[PDB]
Amino acid sequence: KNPKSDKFKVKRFHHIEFWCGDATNVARRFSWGLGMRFSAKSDLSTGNMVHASYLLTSGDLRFLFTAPYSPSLSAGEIKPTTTASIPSFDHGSCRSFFSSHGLGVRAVAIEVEDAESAFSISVANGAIPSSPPIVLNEAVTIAEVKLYGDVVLRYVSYKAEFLPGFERVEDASSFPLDYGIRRLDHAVGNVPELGPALTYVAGFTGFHQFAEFTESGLNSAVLASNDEMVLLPINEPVHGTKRKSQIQTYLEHNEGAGLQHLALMSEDIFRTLREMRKRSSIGGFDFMPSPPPTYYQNLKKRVGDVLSDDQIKECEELGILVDRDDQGTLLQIFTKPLGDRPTIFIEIIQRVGCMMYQSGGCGGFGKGNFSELFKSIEEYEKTLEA
Amino acid sequence: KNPKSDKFKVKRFHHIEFWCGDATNVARRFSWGLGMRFSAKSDLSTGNMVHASYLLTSGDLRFLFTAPYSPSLSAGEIKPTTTASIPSFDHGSCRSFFSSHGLGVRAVAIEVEDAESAFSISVANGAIPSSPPIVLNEAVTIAEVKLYGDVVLRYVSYKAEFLPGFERVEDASSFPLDYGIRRLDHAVGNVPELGPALTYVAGFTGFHQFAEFTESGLNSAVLASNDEMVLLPINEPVHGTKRKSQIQTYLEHNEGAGLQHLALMSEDIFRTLREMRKRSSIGGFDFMPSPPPTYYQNLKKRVGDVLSDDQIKECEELGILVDRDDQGTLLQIFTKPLGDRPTIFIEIIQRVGCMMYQSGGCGGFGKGNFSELFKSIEEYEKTLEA
Ligand SMILES: CC(=O)C1=C(O)C=C2Oc3c(C(C)=O)c(O)c(C)c(O)c3[C@@]2(C)C1=O
Ligand SMILES: CC(=O)C1=C(O)C=C2Oc3c(C(C)=O)c(O)c(C)c(O)c3[C@@]2(C)C1=O
Ligand SMILES: [Co+2]
Ligand SMILES: [Co+2]
């Protein structure tokens, strides 16, 4: 059931901002590995003496990569005179975030009708303020509240081209890469305590519970906006298992709560994964180990109604996982961690079904692949021995 | 003249170590952009709880990329019990270096006959110690002294595979990229005062002056080992010119002295530059703007004895610069800065002549291209107007 209790008008995911040590190298790596175009910049060449910010896009997906310059460049500036294009930016907060967590997501940004009212309403309803509403060039309003750990939920609203102060990138340096990724489907946080985290976030957004889950080492629940196009799962560790909780491992290496994974919807997951896997060992992203043949043998029985034998064979070539709800079918695969620490990673997704446009969350988040993978693995060792 | 006054036995450049925020993303970017293989690692997967270090190689060139993990992972360790594979590493020094300078070279490493004696002799002769000699696995000795700014000269010596504690990389993740780069030719520092810097470095190494230079905005001089295979140019700004000194701009954005550029010798600079330029806008490195056609028209007159018209045309397609000594010919080109700040960049080089093996420094460092580029530029505006 959907109570449509959003406390303000939320539209869609707008962008994800990574806080980096060197935004140039991370952005160029991500661009090649994921097939995202360099679309805009704000840096020394645009008059920004405070931070370097580079924007990559693929369809509606926007990845922002930001790093600080030497504070000495802007020592005579004050906030009213700043050259920063993102006025919430702070040298000290960025260096401390990166020193503490390594490469990771600082901001999950959603587009709202009015960022000033979204901020006021959120804070009125328990949100911890992070950056007050600031109007950029009389055109865009941005505001930030704490989401979990040092991750902020960023509100952006447009009177009506990413942000004022950003410039479109010289087309020679903007190669039209595209591997099929089109938008952000969901963004997942890891926290030490799910209950309080859910209460806090649902408390100030009015987002409703979309789904929930739980021998796995985690509990999770999904918060969703009114039309369920903004999906925010949150995980907590479950202690006392044979294997150490993967969520606990995250918290230890991340020094606490933070963003765990970004799920990127592809319009053609076969082509996305072919293109990404071709580049894994030449600067791109690695993928988790593939399921055994027994997993794909059991897929025929599970989704032979949705996917032909040839489409299943292509899933097996690419390592793709498949889960199915009572409403839709889900194709998914996970990258290895994006950087040095075993913390943040990316998920590639495509959903089948729930046509009306496709409704958000169609097919769930893969809750059935725990059971299937474990059963798959038991049955594969059996064939190997036998 | 060469006095061969080295105070200890120096062999060749061994490796360059970058200090990073995320070594994974910088290494993968450099690998694709420069055509370097992933050759070894020391990280969590090898038992190193302190730092992540990834080694790229192309021929004899070795680029090491190192970043710190959370100190919490190694909080129970002490130096005698450390899991760090590079015992000079310090979380605090690395974060402070990166916070102050951004992405850049921490260590210029040279192979010597005996790193312990090289360290003792250097310190006896005025070198500022940075890390005392440490024997790794009874096989490799490493020691460090200050070179300039926060850059160290690292001595490595082998009894007799990069360093103990490093593991060869899984061949699936080691794609055999190769664009023709084969070794490090020279490494150039920027300092505020050339005289004292030269005195200090020549004082503890016994390296001799190989070359010197100087309206350019800089003074430079080159220190060289006995056989002149280790070449260490150093630049200082010259203040009071129409344009601000490029060296001064470096010092301001780098927060002081540091490594300015690495010159990488190619065995086929045409193929290296074709391969690198193909990748500039898809995750690789950008190049400085090419000289005008007038520069290449005047090359026929200057090196038509060394390069055919077709070889000159290929230089013009690729933006390659050409200088010539009384002893050899030099082909060279410069990248844009490697990261966010207008600080460190790379030079690709190939030398022609001085055969005996080829003697180091063959053809100089491009001192004639100041005059030629300026004259080239004046003559090109002339054709445009006319
Ligand atoms: C929110 C999200 O994005 C998620 C994700 O992408 C991958 C899924 O795998 C699991 C698993 C297992 C056995 O792997 C589990 O035990 C629980 C309790 C769980 O909740 C999930 C999933 C469905 C999930 O939540
Ligand atoms: C040491 C090194 O590697 C160097 C480099 O790679 C590029 C060269 O260009 C110049 C220039 C000009 C006009 O560009 C100059 O005025 C001076 C005094 C100079 O000393 C050099 C060079 C030769 C140099 O030193
Ligand atoms: Co997911
Ligand atoms: Co040079």
Swiss-Prot record, chains A, B:
<dbReference type="InterPro" id="IPR041736">
    <property type="entry name" value="4OHPhenylPyrv_dOase_N"/>
</dbReference>
<keyword id="KW-0963">Cytoplasm</keyword>
<keyword id="KW-0223">Dioxygenase</keyword>
<comment type="function">
    <text>Catalyzes the conversion of 4-hydroxyphenylpyruvic acid to homogentisic acid, one of the steps in tyrosine catabolism.</text>
</comment>
<dbReference type="GO" id="GO:0003868">
    <property type="term" value="F:4-hydroxyphenylpyruvate dioxygenase activity"/>
</dbReference>
<dbReference type="GO" id="GO:0005737">
    <property type="term" value="C:cytoplasm"/>
</dbReference>
<feature type="binding site">
    <location>
        <position position="347"/>
    </location>
    <ligand>
        <name>Fe cation</name>
    </ligand>
</feature>
<keyword id="KW-0828">Tyrosine catabolism</keyword>
<dbReference type="InterPro" id="IPR004360">
    <property type="entry name" value="Glyas_Fos-R_dOase_dom"/>
</dbReference>
<keyword id="KW-0677">Repeat</keyword>
<dbReference type="InterPro" id="IPR037523">
    <property type="entry name" value="VOC"/>
</dbReference>
<feature type="domain" description="VOC 1">
    <location>
        <begin position="12"/>
        <end position="158"/>
    </location>
</feature>
<feature type="binding site">
    <location>
        <position position="186"/>
    </location>
    <ligand>
        <name>Fe cation</name>
    </ligand>
</feature>
<protein>
    <recommendedName>
        <fullName>4-hydroxyphenylpyruvate dioxygenase</fullName>
        <ecNumber>1.13.11.27</ecNumber>
    </recommendedName>
</protein>
<keyword id="KW-0408">Iron</keyword>
<dbReference type="InterPro" id="IPR005956">
    <property type="entry name" value="4OHPhenylPyrv_dOase"/>
</dbReference>
<feature type="domain" description="VOC 2">
    <location>
        <begin position="183"/>
        <end position="336"/>
    </location>
</feature>
<dbReference type="GO" id="GO:0042802">
    <property type="term" value="F:identical protein binding"/>
</dbReference>
<comment type="subunit">
    <text>Homodimer.</text>
</comment>
<keyword id="KW-0479">Metal-binding</keyword>
<dbReference type="GO" id="GO:0006572">
    <property type="term" value="P:tyrosine catabolic process"/>
</dbReference>
<comment type="pathway">
    <text>Cofactor biosynthesis; prenylquinone biosynthesis.</text>
</comment>
<dbReference type="GO" id="GO:0005506">
    <property type="term" value="F:iron ion binding"/>
</dbReference>
<keyword id="KW-0585">Phenylalanine catabolism</keyword>
<comment type="similarity">
    <text>Belongs to the 4HPPD family.</text>
</comment>
<comment type="pathway">
    <text>Amino-acid degradation; L-phenylalanine degradation; acetoacetate and fumarate from L-phenylalanine: step 3/6.</text>
</comment>
<dbReference type="InterPro" id="IPR029068">
    <property type="entry name" value="Glyas_Bleomycin-R_OHBP_Dase"/>
</dbReference>
<dbReference type="InterPro" id="IPR041735">
    <property type="entry name" value="4OHPhenylPyrv_dOase_C"/>
</dbReference>
<dbReference type="GO" id="GO:0006559">
    <property type="term" value="P:L-phenylalanine catabolic process"/>
</dbReference>
<keyword id="KW-0560">Oxidoreductase</keyword>
<dbReference type="Pfam" id="PF00903">
    <property type="entry name" value="Glyoxalase"/>
</dbReference>
<feature type="binding site">
    <location>
        <position position="261"/>
    </location>
    <ligand>
        <name>Fe cation</name>
    </ligand>
</feature>
